[PDB]
Amino acid sequence: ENVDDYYDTGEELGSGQFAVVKKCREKSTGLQYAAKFIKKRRTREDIEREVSILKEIQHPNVITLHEVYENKTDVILILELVAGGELFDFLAEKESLTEEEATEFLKQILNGVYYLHSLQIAHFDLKPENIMLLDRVPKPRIKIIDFGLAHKIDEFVAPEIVNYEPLGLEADMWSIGVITYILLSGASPFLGDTKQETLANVSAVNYEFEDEYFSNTSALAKDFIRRLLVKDPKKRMTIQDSLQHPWIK
Amino acid sequence: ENVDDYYDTGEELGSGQFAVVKKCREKSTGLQYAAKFIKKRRTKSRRGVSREDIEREVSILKEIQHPNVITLHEVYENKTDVILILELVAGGELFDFLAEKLTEEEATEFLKQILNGVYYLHSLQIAHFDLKPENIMLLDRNVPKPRIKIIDFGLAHKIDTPEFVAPEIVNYEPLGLEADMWSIGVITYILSGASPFLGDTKQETLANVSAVNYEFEDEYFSALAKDFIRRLLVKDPKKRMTIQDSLQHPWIK
Numbered sequence: 274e275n276v277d278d279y280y281d282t283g284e285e286l287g288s289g290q291f292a293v294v295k296k297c298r299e300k301s302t303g304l305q306y307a308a309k310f311i312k313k314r315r316t317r318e319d320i321e322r323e324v325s326i327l328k329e330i331q332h333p334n335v336i337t338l339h340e341v342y343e344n345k346t347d348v349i350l351i352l353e354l355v356a357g358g359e360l361f362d363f364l365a366e367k368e369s370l371t372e373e374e375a376t377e378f379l380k381q382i383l384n385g386v387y388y389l390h391s392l393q394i395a396h397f398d399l400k401p402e403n404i405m406l407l408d409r410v411p412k413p414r415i416k417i418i419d420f421g422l423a424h425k426i427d428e429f430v431a432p433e434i435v436n437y438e439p440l441g442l443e444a445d446m447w448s449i450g451v452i453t454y455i456l457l458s459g460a461s462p463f464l465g466d467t468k469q470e471t472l473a474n475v476s477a478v479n480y481e482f483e484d485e486y487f488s489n490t491s492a493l494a495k496d497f498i499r500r501l502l503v504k505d506p507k508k509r510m511t512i513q514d515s516l517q518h519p520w521i522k
Numbered sequence: 523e524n525v526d527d528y529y530d531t532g533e534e535l536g537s538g539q540f541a542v543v544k545k546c547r548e549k550s551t552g553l554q555y556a557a558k559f560i561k562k563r564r565t566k567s568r569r570g571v572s573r574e575d576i577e578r579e580v581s582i583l584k585e586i587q588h589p590n591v592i593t594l595h596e597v598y599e600n601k602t603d604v605i606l607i608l609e610l611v612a613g614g615e616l617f618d619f620l621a622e623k624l625t626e627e628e629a630t631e632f633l634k635q636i637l638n639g640v641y642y643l644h645s646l647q648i649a650h651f652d653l654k655p656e657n658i659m660l661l662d663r664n665v666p667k668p669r670i671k672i673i674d675f676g677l678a679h680k681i682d683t684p685e686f687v688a689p690e691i692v693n694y695e696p697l698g699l700e701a702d703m704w705s706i707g708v709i710t711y712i713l714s715g716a717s718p719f720l721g722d723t724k725q726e727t728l729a730n731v732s733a734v735n736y737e738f739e740d741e742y743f744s745a746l747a748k749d750f751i752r753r754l755l756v757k758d759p760k761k762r763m764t765i766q767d768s769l770q771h772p773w774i775k
């Protein structure tokens with residue numbers, strides 16, 4: 274079925290390796306949507322994962338799906354439009370945030386993830402380029418975007434089975450700590466001068482609150498971060514705890 | 523769906539925690555079959571199989587066809603069970619054939635068939651994840667070079683930022699095809715009537731496995747056979763022998 278029979282195509286709002294997101298006006302209603310053209314591999318299922326999860330969720334702080342189309346070589350997702358650009362870009366124009374602003378972005382994000390975690394959904398790609406503003410208001414409104422790294426979480430055996438250990442919701446929480454750290458400072462807590470180094474940094478949980486940025490940061494803000502950047506997932510603060518943390522109160 | 527309308531039930535062919543398998547005769551045609559009765563999960567509860575796991579078993583069998591793997595004929599379902607009607611394999615489990623008796627050649631005759639089956643499956647990016655004697659069946663137990671079919675696909679699967687990424691994703695290695703290869707290693711080895719990593723506790727057994735604590739005991743062994751096992755029973759997955767390699771191995775070609 275032909276998407277050009279229902280929507281008038283606008284110009285791009287984003288890119289990635291195998292996806293273009295362009296603005297799109299619905300012929301019948303005049304309403305504008307964000308169309309995600311995901312080019313299918315010609316020789317996916319990751320695309321049905323993404324769709325089925327987008328179909329399940331509805332929350333003020335997550336993006337809604339509207340319809341889904343398929344052509345010869347792209348599979349198309351008509352999605353809730355979000356017009357205020359990326360928190361990433363708001364984060365660039367602002368160089369960092371006061372605690373009061375960080376907390377009011379962070380409250381919304383927390384709420385979106387709470388909701389998701391209540392449905393056993395893990396996002397697995399929480400980061401500013403995937404967080405989006407509605408209107409760029411002095412106290413702006415966010416929507417979580419970019420799904421499908423999102424996943425529903427539930428004697429002869431080989432060594433890598435014997436010590437398996439599956440991934441979970443806790444990975445999201447870790448990203449939230451990394452997001453918060455960036456929110457309050459210029460900076461990215463683990464970045465090294467090379468990818469190798471950054472990966473080593475993340476594994477050894479090797480970060481500091483350097484004075485250049487954190488010299489006046491509240492105890493409560495440091496506490497919140499420290500409690501989320503914790504190597505063993507079972508001791509990381511959960512979504513529920515994070516919403517009660519007195520820095521969020 | 524209602525299976526007793528179309529099949530006369532037979533003798534129990536085998537059992538498990540969540541399934542029962544019986545011989546049945548297709549009323550239409552006289553032909554015979556193996557009916558795998560799988561208990562459905564009541565709630566999301568750890569008795570029964572989930573609807574998802576049952577579907578994955580059906581899907582994979584639906585897709586495969588090769589002399590060394592087993593076929594799916596039809597699927598029934600009632601309030602309690604998902605019933606899989608499977609190609610019958612009449613000659614018992616490799617487990618029982620081993621209990622009732624191996625020279626290197628007898629063993630080699632079995633292994634190649636297994637290799638052939640696993641090579642087929644891998645080529646479809648299906649890891650089996652439960653290769654063991656009780657999941658290998660013989661077409662007939664009374665011939666000098668028994669033929670085999672791999673069965674029991676209940677665990678089988680299809681085989682498919684950094685700054686923000688948690689430590690356990692950084693360190694995450696996915697399970698893939700190499701697991702099957704280790705298992706073949708254990709299988710080859712059981713061909714001695716002896717299991718390479720057995721303990722006294724199931725903890726003892728599990729310690730052994732992840733530490734790679736096997737030896738070729740003089741009591742059992744006494745030469746290219748052991749190179750084959752060794753280049754398989756290896757901790758780091760990515761450096762085990764793959765199914766193509768195992769087939770190019772001099773103990774094989």
Ligand SMILES: Nc1ncnc2c1ncn2[C@@H]1O[C@H](COP(=O)(O)OP(=O)(O)CP(=O)(O)O)[C@@H](O)[C@H]1O
Nearest residue numbers: 286287289290291292294307352353354355402419
């Ligand atoms: N609903 C929406 N409203 C406005 N812009 C959106 C949007 N969904 C996506 N975008 C644009 O595209 C990006 C989000 O979806 P995304 O493009 O991340 O899918 P993706 O990450 O799979 C591309 P890739 O994986 O190839 O890098 C954002 O940076 C955004 O600018």
Ligand SMILES: Nc1ncnc2c1ncn2[C@@H]1O[C@H](COP(=O)(O)OP(=O)(O)CP(=O)(O)O)[C@@H](O)[C@H]1O
Nearest residue numbers: 536538539540541543556608609610611656674676
């Ligand atoms: N197609 C077939 N032909 C002949 N015999 C079969 C067969 N499928 C199964 N059997 C016999 O019954 C047993 C049951 O099938 P299979 O047991 O391997 O599923 P399963 O092992 O996952 C049950 P559980 O997980 O609850 O232990 C086999 O070990 C075998 O003895």
Ligand SMILES: [Mg+2]
Nearest residue numbers: 289402403419
């Ligand atoms: Mg993205």
Ligand SMILES: [Mg+2]
Nearest residue numbers: 419420421422
């Ligand atoms: Mg993406």
Ligand SMILES: [Mg+2]
Nearest residue numbers: 538656657674
């Ligand atoms: Mg079995």
Ligand SMILES: [Mg+2]
Nearest residue numbers: 652674676677
């Ligand atoms: Mg099984």
